[PDB]
Amino acid sequence: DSLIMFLVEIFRSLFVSNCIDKNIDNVLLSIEEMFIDHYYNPQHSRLKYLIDDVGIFFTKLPITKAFHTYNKKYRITKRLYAPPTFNEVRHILNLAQILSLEEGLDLLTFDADETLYPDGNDEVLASYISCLLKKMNIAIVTAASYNNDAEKYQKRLENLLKYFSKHNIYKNFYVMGGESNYLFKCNEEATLYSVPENEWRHYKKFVDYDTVQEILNISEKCLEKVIKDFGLCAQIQRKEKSIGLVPNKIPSQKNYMIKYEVLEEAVIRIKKEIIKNKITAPYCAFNGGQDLWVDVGNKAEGLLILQKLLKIQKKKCCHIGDQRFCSLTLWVSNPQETKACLKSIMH
Amino acid sequence: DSLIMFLVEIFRSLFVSNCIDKNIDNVLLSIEEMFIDHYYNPQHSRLKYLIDDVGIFFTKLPITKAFHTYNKKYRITKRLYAPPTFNEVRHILNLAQILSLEEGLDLLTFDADETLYPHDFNDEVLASYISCLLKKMNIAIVTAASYNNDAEKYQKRLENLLKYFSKHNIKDGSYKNFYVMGGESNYLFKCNEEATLYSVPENEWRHYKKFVDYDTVQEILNISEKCLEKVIKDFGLCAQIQRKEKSIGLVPNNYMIKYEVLEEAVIRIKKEIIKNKITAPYCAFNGGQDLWVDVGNKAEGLLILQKLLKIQKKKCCHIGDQFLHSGNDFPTRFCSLTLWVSNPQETKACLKSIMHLN
Amino acid sequence: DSLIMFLVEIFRSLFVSNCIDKNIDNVLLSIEEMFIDHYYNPQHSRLKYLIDDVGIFFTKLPITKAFHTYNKKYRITKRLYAPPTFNEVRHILNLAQILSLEEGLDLLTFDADETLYPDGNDEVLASYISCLLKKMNIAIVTAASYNNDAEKYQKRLENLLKYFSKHNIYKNFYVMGGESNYLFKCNEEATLYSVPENEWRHYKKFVDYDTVQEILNISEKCLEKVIKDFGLCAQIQRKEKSIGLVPNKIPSQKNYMIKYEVLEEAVIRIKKEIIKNKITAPYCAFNGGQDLWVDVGNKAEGLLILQKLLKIQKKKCCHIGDQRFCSLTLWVSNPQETKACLKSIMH
Amino acid sequence: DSLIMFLVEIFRSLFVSNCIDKNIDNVLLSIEEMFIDHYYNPQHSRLKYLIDDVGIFFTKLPITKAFHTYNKKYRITKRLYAPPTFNEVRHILNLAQILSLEEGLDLLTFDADETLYPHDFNDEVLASYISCLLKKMNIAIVTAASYNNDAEKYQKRLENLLKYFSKHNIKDGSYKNFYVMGGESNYLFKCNEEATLYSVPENEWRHYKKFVDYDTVQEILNISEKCLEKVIKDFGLCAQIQRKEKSIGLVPNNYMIKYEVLEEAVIRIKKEIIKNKITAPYCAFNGGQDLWVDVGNKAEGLLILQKLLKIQKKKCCHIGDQFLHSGNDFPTRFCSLTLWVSNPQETKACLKSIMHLN
């Protein structure tokens, strides 16, 4: 991330010049003003000249207030031998984006790929998530596709729903499967039903069936090449609007393992070949540590569906994931961070 | 750490020139010839000029065969968009060091703290590998944990592995060839037929350990005590200080402590200890959520077993997980063969590869 | 230059792996094939994936033959402590591009900004340039504009023409003023006349007069801002299709000096502001160490004029300058290098 | 070289954060406070920790005033697309070192080889600056050129500057306060009323120069002679070897030699000389088209004048052009104040700024 680096180099220079524990507010306010000017002029701001991939700011980032708030609690400027690190500046930018939600947020989305759990939960999470549900809409997005088989989505994340049956009552909880292709809701008794197409068919970006089938054919061709090239013991699974690469199960249980480097290569191979056919339709190929899934859809399309379905402005939506231009983003990497951010959001 | 990065930068240029999946043997052989010259002339080798902190090669290293063998199993050179990574070159140098044990392997030492268990030992697969290797050679387990020669405390985290020896490795007499060191290089133990850890008096083998005055031991503990007390007040910690003989540490109450706070305090301790020009052996070990300062280093502990068991330096190998410059495994590169590792799964793999004696 | 760096990193790894003085031909041939594949597929080659700004190859670069030829003469691989440097790899790429001219070259162009002389020549140059003129067309390009006043172009480079009056006889020598706006030729007796517009008016890229006047107005506004901001003692000079920033003359001779850093800033300021008005017309702002000149034109337009006027394929044109996609380029920085390259071209 | 890069990296971050043209005094003052602590405690300063080869600050450095004054004259902070460059920070540290001469300047030394003339001295403006400063303090000219105490040869390249002293600086008696050193630190000279360079016997001031055995002098010359002979054959040079007493060099016949060939040969000479553990003073000076090895360094030469003229270390300043790590001016940072320069134009500028005594 060039935005985090950008700040890391600056903090490193203040640290090595021996004034980082002094009053650096003159530098922080000059940085904050560049952020705010980019908020009004995302296309031609000077911040755009420094960071080409800066993206878009839906909020006025209070980075100065975030630095003081982070420094007071963790006291990183008292360090004499290690300047602020990449991971620490990452939490500061999360805090700045959390703090920028002064007007409140009505939509909160969770990337449930790996950030939330390795397998099937956390009660402190479920307790914190439930508190937020009464305040505003929440949503959970999965890259796995089981078509519309609602029972399969429940198996991967059933424990958190058990808390919701108690201490709730409500209808402000949503689950998105296939990245942006299947949207479910919740009734009363430990539920998992699918909203009909009429409620959200128009909001989905229009794509042809043959175009959808074309992407899966291209991805199917690449994975076979990946399987044969790296000699993996794996099987390909094609679905309606998705295709996935899964490892073989050890005969007897537990499944075999694919090296993480090979999965990262296949994602680049698939993404590159899709661009070769000049396909403009939305798509995404996600690596889940042990699985590879290609969906005809992306988090951006699914995020827009929820904003348009629930009539929420983009400034009131927030996303938490391990990995764009349509919602505020918090970068985490473990469930404890997800609960750590959610604890800060409670105010 | 820098030898690995040395190879990563080279393989990156081969990948980038589109020839890494071709025959790169002329480059690899030139690298191997440099490893041979460092093996023969460690003090003024060409490799020492390129890499100052390279360490000592106690054996000739088949780096070409390792790359060739590792590529045949993992096909890393078939990748179009990812050059050989840091961990893959790490695995390559691991196998090259294993293949350099053609002469034999008399002693094998493992880090207790993190290469064997998350903590409580609870891996039946790992211990089943350990028993077979134990039959053919002596093994030892080195921990930074410090209990003042209390064999009951050390056996707690290692109960299952020791209890395994009773059912499979008790009759063959292999139990005598198993040792445990506590406080890095302060308390040595051994096993009996009842699968229990018993003690060996520090007076029995103090001839092999460089003595340190009791006042200088307490000197190091008091300097560290001041730094840890200053560190707690500086960052507003919730943790407390626990002191024992020949060892002091920072322990929470359990509130997790940030990694950066622990790492700098190691630097402050090491920097302030240097300010008094202390030449005694010591180490500031950074744990997951704790910090510990011991009088004595793993290098001294590994030297004791070599002198005690009369084992040759080239026949001794060590398996540690923290081979970073700040880690306590970094100095052990000068007294034994070393295998960088990260978890039991990787440790069981290196042990599986080691079980090809021939 | 990313292409030169690209090779410097590779040579550095061969050097540090202690095999650079051995047979590195396996690496060089793999590099050469990437160059050749980029020659056939400039838009989607793998070299394009490694070097985004690689440009275009009008020739099959014999980089392997260039390395051996450069190594045999200078013996750089016998070094034990310094790998091949950026400047050395630069000469190799010049040699490779010179060697690629196996089918001969009919056009040779010289960037006369600073590469050829600081002031008004070199007889060894003039002797070498004259030998090439009988073989093929030569051309000299200047950023300075004196409209069509041919006498002023002659004053800056009159000494080389004195050699041409002797040992010649002919009509294959050309001079381009205003980057791409004024084209002159040579008669018999120490000459400097201008070819009429009809011979080359159609080949110039069509641009409106008000558009040309717009660029000079924008550049005039920037230079005044540069003058007032940095407090320079300088005067602005506007012309028909150019505007320049010149320093004041010390009263009494010799002229004042502008710091080189300020001139480089004004070029970026002018170029940036021209893009702000979305001007698509060709232009260039050149820094000449002591002068700044903005021309409505560029070396690319002038190069195309000479190729179309003289009916020469792009594979037979070569340019020598200190600083694109329409001719082969040799990178030099001093007159001795220019004569050094020309000595190699004589075969 | 690394202190300059230290400031360049800091100013780059200030420029990038859009506040460099605002008030950056809090950052600059923190930098100045570090320069004061290094001035007081050079051995274990915080600045030495960040920059290991920083050198010695013989005076407190007004780095803020230098930046403020330099910005007022050149307005570098008004640039939108170019942070302060390497040479601008160099000029800033030059002025800060000049402004640190508030106490006085008794001795000023110039590199003859390249800070005074392209070579033949031929700048009337430079010499006219030299005469005025010569009236108020002693100046000296240090050259790597080696002629065995032949005053006629040294005066050739310096004729115009010496002849200028006869017409303007001969009556005031200032001629006595002007010295010339040859062979870096081997032959000292002086001037008379007739504007001629006369010699001073090396026996007269050998008490100030650390003696070196004649066999060890020839030892260094023979080691260099082997390297240069090997270098010529290695790269197929056309040059030849010229040897004198206490000095040896590589000279063409005049075919220009590549810069990289000269620079590595300096490394080979320095590396091989270190291999014999020679502690004598020496230097391998890289010229434009030649290479020279002298027995004795500029640090020794600058030390002689301080001990001979009894001048204080802080009152001595040096003006050299090659302050790179490989250059011969690099060691002079530990015995005198230093001003990095590149040509007479820059040298006349520093001399012009120096003419504000007050």
Author numbering:
A (entry chain B), C (entry chain B): 60 to 179, 183 to 231, 236 to 318, 325 to 395, 406 to 429
B (entry chain A), D (entry chain A): 60 to 177, 180 to 314, 327 to 431
Quoted from the paper:
These enzymes catalyze the dephosphorylation of ribo- and deoxyribonucleoside monophosphates to their corresponding nucleosides, and also exhibit, in certain cases phosphotransferase activity. All structures adopt a tetrameric assembly displaying a cross-like shape, in agreement with the quaternary solution structure. Each subunit consists of four domains: an “N-Terminal Regulatory Domain” (NTRD, M1 to K59), an “OD” (D60 to T143), a HAD-like Catalytic Domain (CD, F144 to K270 and K371 to Q444) and a C2 cap domain13 (K271 to N370).
Moreover, deletion of the NTRDs (PfISN1-∆N59) inactivates the enzyme at pH 8, while at pH 5 there is a sixfold drop in activity. We demonstrated that when lacking NTRDs as in PfISN1-ΔN59 the activity is highly compromised. This is likely due to its incapacity to stabilize SegmentD394-F407 containing the ubiquitous HAD family motif IV, which is mandatory for coordinating IMP-Mg2+.
